[PDB]
Symmetry: C4
Subunit: 349 residues, 4 copies
């Protein structure tokens, strides 16, 4: 959805004065045809009759004016009401796939002028926004909340399964018994979880102010998921991979590519044919995930540790003395690494 | 519910153009009587007057036409609108249990012609679909979402209890202190959980496109439950049982038979009279569940392991050398089996 | 709420044909005044004019008849429609606190005849049922579902807190460091949880068929809570207490008495003044809870074990030989008791 | 929101007879203009015509009277209905930002008389309450329940994350490996959780009787959170801090100040510049949290223990003999402290 169009959508999103007025118009079953222009004098060819108002905008004024037949003309920033009860006359030759005089008029005028035109039928509760060659149907909050609440509840389920796969993989990592199947399975669920987030995003935006709690819920649920997926990619990719490259891997599986077993294993650098082979491939974590998230060791410094010990397994066997031989690790970071790992092994395994 | 009827239901399920039109008809309180035929010329005996249109179908056209009294005649694939404002005259002698001219007309015409007839009253919000001798009442999405959301919330509860019973049984299995009561109790909850899924299924289908999130939620919640139940049956049945036979046991308790303690113990091969005897019967897991789900050993190969060690208890005491004496188990699978079991015992017990 | 009245409520609960008709009447904004009698000939003094029908009842017939002014007279079992469009004339001297002719008429007639009278106003969506001197207002399903869904969600919260208190008490029990405060705190939450269940019960009943999922949810959530509370009472009461007596203690705190710290400690047999003293009183579990729920030892036999070992602490130190000296405990039950306890200590502590 | 205004809001909150009447007025689309005064005789200058009633108030009476045009005059405590169908004539010169005769009249009269004036338009479902220079818009229960249910669901998410941070910090505390980052992160989530509670509070109040379940849910979810945050502040502040001072720290971050890392660390007494330095600062718990919440040692006595051992780490190494050297700790409290700590270390680490 183009950004130039997303900007216009904000104009009638829950929270704005304009939307408050449109909600009331809908509740009263009045119809509405609103034309947003900047220079009223320049549309004497498409705007006919009505009353010249040139007054300050307000939700109550718009509502009251919508009681009359015809269209209302507002300024682009919704600060002035220019005309009311006007007859809009766009070029009849302009193609339109709309039905009815009001919507056909709205699409034609928007295409002809490159301006925003809002239409509301008397019987229905949707707001149709036309801008240039675009058409966006805005829904009432109740419909949006139902979809968003369902999506969140769905996300909770995926997240619960992600957490179980993660704790299981954690045990396998600490014991160095991880297979490519385990890794890919965890990444797959992580990619599916973030995809759901991406798909509900437009619903959230459209909710405007009414989407505050929904946003907070999405944040609490998916907080550090992205980072976690990036660290897993770095820890299990066939060959050393830069963080940015890992983040790009993530972005691709979250939008373009499809998170299938073989496909994920393929992008990780493993030449696998059948998904049954995944259980056959053994892999050892580099150690980034634990070093950063648990030992609180910056990636730039974690590279150094991996460069020397190569795997988490070796890192877990290294003494403080051993660890201090690494650039960037003093008695403090050496203790943190050593202690955080020995603590997890004892508690988890 | 016959499949030939489920096909017709899809025609007016959320997502289709036809349903979009019917939703609008309902919202406007217009009534509707739609007849779906393939060869319009062949019904001159039941179709009278009106206007011959023979035009391409669209939701807006259907809606506009429903403003007139009478019936609308569409093509079976909903691509053409043949007539509008017609008088439908089915045989008056045909039996009908419907009330009112419109619904009695619809049921008679559907029975007389073997075709689909859709009726909508002006005052109510349900869609009545008649086909041959069938009648299916389709509900609005809001009603369906309420029932489905409740069922899912209910499933979450059953699943939480299933998970607790499973972790408890896991401890008992690793310690070899399982009784027939423990097994049957876990299977019972598992059968009750899947039954709920089966009962909400028609609601999900009827939701059409609006049932996407609901489906994803059901999948995340019951993902590997079926497999798990089949493996339990294989591990605790009185005598060795094939997977297919286990899957058939599952299908029966999920639809036909009732998951009562004694009944489940009976089908497992145990001659028990009172449910109080279940706590008295000791049983030892064959080992399939752990071998497949944890060691990732294919059932065909797990049979071999069980054939030799007979029980999970013995399998847990076998060394890698011991395990490698089995056909299909090399140093890799022997390690996986041995390590995965010793890890669970240490962590869980 | 009297049972004789609960019986009449069932007549118009979701699921019945009568309620289906009333729902439609409400949806159409028609009013309704229904009189349920067994012998129509015997009310010529309160029933005037209208049409004598004496026909079989059906939802559609009732609905159609409600289009006329006046009242409808049905048979008590809702199988016949006796009159329609009648004028009901109860004694004007009978006291009534209702407003409007229809509701004042309904209450007077119900009091005068001891029969059921149902009233529905044209503008509102509630069903008012009058029977003798009772009046019950039945609500639409949507209102009931909202309250019930909220209550269940609330129960989930109390249950989560109950579970945390229980696992904490479990640790304390296995270690024999329980104080009267710990016990009372757990019982209090358990009494509050079951009370909520008792308060939502009428809402559930009133939901009729539409309350199936709600019931299943309440069952899964509070399944073995009652038993658990009874066993705790038996394990921590100051002096040995019979099961029935424990169940009566439970029933009282779930309805009559208020679950306050001191009050619960008082009824347990402990003479405590301030709630601050609770942390000062040390108590040792008899062992019933663990013996029955974990070792699967019947209470009649558990009494024997307690009679000899006195406390769970001693029971946990007893060998199989020691345990077998008890009446009712053989090598099987001795092993179960010994093994189940040693397993919990190892896993939990 | 001023308390003098909150008092007036209660007058029309769900549960009151007045609100029951207003809900009905709204459902019937009747309008309403209600004036609440104590001495009717004293407003002959703003009250004109209508009917003098001087009768007892009831919901049905108010409803019936609202069918007439004009205003209704009630007594301040809602016990009497003084006038009906009156013309209200407040001073036209008084400033008003309202639209329409009814709302402009209501705001003017409330400002002019310092009394409560309630306005309801025929088309909308909100109740507008005017009092002196205040204006409060009351919403229907369905709107409030949706917001409250969302907020609670959001709180559940924050609480789940708080619990995970707490268990993680618990491990770090028992092992004495806590950094200022860990502490601040936990406090931040705790401050964000309580803030949400504070923001939903007005919605809860406005729900009146319909907010009972909502309140119970908020209580179960945030039960001992405040105490826990206060104890953390006491355990990790740079210098010894009194409980009251800790509670004041809490109140500030829950309303005035913003819970940002550096800001929280700053108020704790640590001179930190960048949030990256937090991971660099090591801190040791005083021991209050564990002493009070786990050992059940009063803060007044816990001060003594800390005064001597200084840190939880030292407290965990102290023998019963060592602990008994402290004022206020006998064999009982010494055992509780020693045993509760050794139990946590064994179970958690
Ligand atoms: N060129 C044409 N071709 C065929 N029929 C025509 C027509 N012009 C007017 N009508 C018929 O008259 C109806 C009502 O016209 P009206 O101006 O009151 O009431 C109108 C008007 O207030 C507004 N509206 C529609 N087009 C407009 C425009 N170009 N400019 C300003 N307002 C418009 O929307 C209302 C409803 O529109 P709707 O089509 O549902 O309803 C239309 C339509 O059935
Ligand atoms: N054979 C008969 N016996 C008794 N009464 C008769 C009748 N034929 C017509 N009516 C009376 O006239 C009403 C309205 O007829 P209408 O054609 O406008 O309005 C009709 C019509 O547009 C449509 N409809 C019903 N039957 C139809 C049919 N066989 N073919 C096409 N349209 C039909 O449904 C609308 C409402 O039907 P509804 O029964 O509620 O309402 C009926 C009914 O009360
Ligand atoms: N004794 C009386 N005193 C004062 N006013 C009187 C009255 N009798 C009749 N009315 C006035 O006439 C209105 C409509 O009478 P209606 O019979 O059409 O329409 C009635 C009638 O169909 C039904 N209904 C009420 N009482 C009934 C009864 N005793 N028997 C059968 N039907 C009754 O409920 C409808 C609405 O009742 P509602 O009171 O709202 O509306 C009443 C009321 O304002
Ligand atoms: N001074 C004035 N300036 C301009 N127009 C005037 C006016 N006085 C009356 N009207 C016009 O008459 C309409 C209806 O008057 P009404 O008394 O029936 O019906 C009224 C009345 O029952 C009530 N209401 C409004 N102001 C009131 C007041 N000061 N005292 C008592 N009742 C009032 O609210 C109803 C609707 O008010 P609404 O303004 O929507 O509708 C008003 C308005 O369009």
């Amino acid at each position: 959805v183009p950004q130039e169009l997303i900007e216009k959508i904000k104009l009638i999103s829950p929270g704005t004065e304009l939307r408050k007025a449109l909600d009331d118009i809908i509740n009263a079953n009045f119809g509405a045809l609103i034309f947003l222009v900047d220079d009223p004098k320049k549309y004497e060819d498409v705007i006919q009759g009505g009353f010249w108002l040139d007054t300050d905008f307000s939700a109550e004024k718009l509502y009251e004016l919508s009681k009359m037949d015809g269209a209302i003309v507002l300024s682009e920033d919704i600060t002035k009401i220019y005309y009311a009860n006007v007859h809009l006359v766009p070029d009849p030759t302009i193609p339109t796939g709309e039905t009815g005089t009001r919507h056909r008029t709205a699409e034609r005028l928007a295409k002809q002028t490159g301006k925003v035109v809002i239409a509301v039928s008397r019987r229905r509760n949707i707001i149709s926004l036309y801008y240039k060659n675009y058409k966006y149907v805005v829904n009432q909050v109740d419909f949006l909340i139902s979809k968003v609440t369902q999506a969140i509840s769905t996300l909770e389920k995926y997240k619960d399964n992600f957490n179980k796969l993660l704790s299981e993989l954690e045990v396998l990592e600490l014991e160095n018994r991880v297979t490519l199947a385990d890794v890919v399975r965890t990444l797959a669920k992580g990619f599916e979880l973030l995809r759901i987030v991406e798909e509900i995003r437009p619903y959230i935006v459209e909710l405007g102010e009414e989407g505050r709690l929904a946003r907070m819920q999405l944040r609490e649920l998916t907080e550090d998921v992205d980072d976690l997926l990036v660290l897993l990619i770095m820890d299990y990719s066939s060959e050393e991979v830069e963080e940015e490259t890992a983040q790009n891997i993530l972005q691709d599986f979250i939008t373009r590519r499809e998170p299938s077993p073989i496909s994920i294993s393929r992008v990780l650098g493993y030449d696998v044919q059948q998904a049954a082979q995944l259980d056959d491939v053994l892999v050892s974590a580099r150690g980034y995930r634990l070093l950063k998230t648990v030992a609180r060791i910056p990636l730039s410094i974690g590279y150094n540790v991996v460069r020397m010990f190569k795997t988490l397994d070796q890192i877990s066997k290294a003494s403080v003395e051993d660890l201090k031989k690494v650039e960037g690790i003093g008695e403090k970071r050496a203790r943190a690494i050593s202690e955080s790992i020995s603590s997890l092994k004892h508690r988890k395994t």
